């Protein structure tokens with residue numbers, strides 16, 4: 601029941617499941633922080649292991665494709681176990697691999713990818729209580 605927002609230190613927006621799409625494989629973007637029962641697609645929590653999940657469907661963050669998207673949690677899939685570590689959303693099995701915001705080149709909402717930690721604010725996040 602302890603949910604939170606993940607805000608980018610790059611654009612000050614927050615991780616958000618694209619268009620509130622509940623289906624697995626939905627792209628995760630950054631969007632203006634909403635408030636109320638409509639913020640569900642922007643709310644996250646950590647399971648007992650500390651692995652990040654979405655309040656919307658309990659799905660985990662998955663970095664199997666070009667951009668991060670939601671996918672059912674699988675303890676056997678290394679690209680679906682992401683945890684909070686200070687200012688970074690780190691891959692549980694490889695802390696050197698962290699999430700980072702990447703602005704759009706087409707004037708759309710920014711997307712997210714996972715790559716080597718390079719110290720930029722694009723790879724820093726702030727956990728913000730609900």
Ligand SMILES: OC[C@H]1O[C@@H](O[C@H]2[C@H](O)[C@@H](O)[C@H](O)O[C@@H]2CO)[C@H](O)[C@@H](O)[C@H]1O
Nearest residue numbers: 616617618619620631634638641642709
């Ligand atoms: O565009 C991302 C943005 O979508 C909001 O939801 C919209 C969707 O964008 C729009 O195309 C559709 O017609 O209506 C949806 C309901 O508002 C999300 O609420 C927002 O968080 C972003 O994900």
